[PDB]
Structure 1
Amino acid sequence: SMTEYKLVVVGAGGVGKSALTIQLIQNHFVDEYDPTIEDSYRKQVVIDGETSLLDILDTAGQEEYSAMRDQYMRTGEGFLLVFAINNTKSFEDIHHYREQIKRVKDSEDVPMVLVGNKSDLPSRTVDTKQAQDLARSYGIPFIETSAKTRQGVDDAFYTLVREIRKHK
């Protein structure tokens, strides 16, 4: 059977984790805010000529439950670190998510992709330069996305799969 990849989407509340996942799975854009408890999805794709089954865990940004993430971080194989380009706080929260994943998995070599979402909005507060520099310091790719226009949606999930393949 095709290889399965356990992908986890993390980041602050409201940054577009669910909008990105639903765009990937269902090819439409949720414009309303339905804050997530926890949702799981599956999709088969072809990446670099190899068919793969994506198991996607869409997590809660709700920050009062930060002490509840260890088990899904242990299980997950790769992580989309999502911030919104118009929310500097969500960009600052990224370091905390990466540190938590590295700590919980007790490893410096965890597949991750930095995702700056909402790239369709004019109210940018996070420079592309700041995001690229951060991802360069983490040694991970950086993808700019819009769940509204679908820009970069496939690229972000497919790049994470490529990171996981390199890790095996």
Structure 2
Amino acid sequence: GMTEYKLVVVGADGVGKSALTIQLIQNHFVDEYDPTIEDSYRKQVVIDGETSLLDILDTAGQEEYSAMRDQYMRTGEGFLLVFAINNTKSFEDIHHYREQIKRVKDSEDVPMVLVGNKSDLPSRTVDTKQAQDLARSYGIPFIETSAKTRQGVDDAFYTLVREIRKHKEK
């Protein structure tokens, strides 16, 4: 069989959510992608030998808190918390996005992976150990990625699928 996974990519504007998503869907780097458009994208892959359909919601748009948007976000089975390693403010915002996921999911156990993107850039301001400590505080995996080179991209999405699998087994 194939298993479908609804993944949601969240994080501050400009961190590479769309670039990561399009790397997964299309296997190359799209540097200027519709900064204002929120869409979902589907891709069949194979993860640990299991055919997997990834349905990826690339978030964007206005900050809105409503019953309708909560219920749409609630359909995510797992979430990528993305910041950029040259952008300390995006790192500081991670806690807010995690907070919102727990609320709409109404569970302390939501599959999540912390993603530090833009690892190809030399101007690093977020130390890998600091991001690891944040991930430890949440009990989730941390993966460094470059949507530009594709390093870490499959690991980030596939690790999230493995976290969802753990959750579904309960």
The verdict on a shared fold, with TM-score over 0.5 as the criterion, is: yes
Q: Structure 1 residues 117 and 65, CA, compared in 2 at 3 Å: closer, same or farther?
A: farther
Q: Structure 1 residues 128 and 68, CA, compared in 2 at 3 Å: closer, same or farther?
A: farther
Question: Structure 1, unaligned stretches of length 5 or more?
Answer: none
- Percent identity for Structure 1 against Structure 2: 99
Q: Is the 8 A contact 1:13 1:61 kept in 2?
A: no
Deviation, structure 1 residue 27: 1.4
Q: Is the 8 A contact 2:47 2:158 kept in 1?
A: yes
Q: Is the 8 A contact 2:143 2:155 kept in 1?
A: yes
Q: Is the 8 A contact 1:14 1:61 kept in 2?
A: no
Aligned residue pairs total 168
Q: Is the 8 A contact 1:43 1:53 kept in 2?
A: yes
Matched residue of 2:24: which SS?
Answer: helix
Deviation, structure 1 residue 46: 1.1
Q: Structure 1 residues 8 and 23, CA, compared in 2 at 3 Å: closer, same or farther?
A: same
Question: Structure 2, unaligned stretches of length 5 or more?
Answer: none
Q: Deviations over 1:83-116 (max 9, x none)?
A: 0001111001100000111011111000000000
Root-mean-square deviation (CA), in Å? 1.8
Structure 1: distance between partners of 2:37 and 2:137: 31
Q: Deviations over 1:119-163 (max 9, x none)?
A: 001111111111000001101000000000000011100000000
Q: Deviations over 1:59-103 (max 9, x none)?
A: 016547799742232110000000000111100110000011101
The list of structure 1 runs, each at least 4 consecutive aligned residues, that deviate by more than 6 angstroms after superposition, is 64-68
Q: Structure 1 residues 65 and 119, CA, compared in 2 at 3 Å: closer, same or farther?
A: farther
Could you tell me the TM-score, scaled by structure 1's length?
0.93
Q: Structure 1 residues 80 and 61, CA, compared in 2 at 3 Å: closer, same or farther?
A: farther
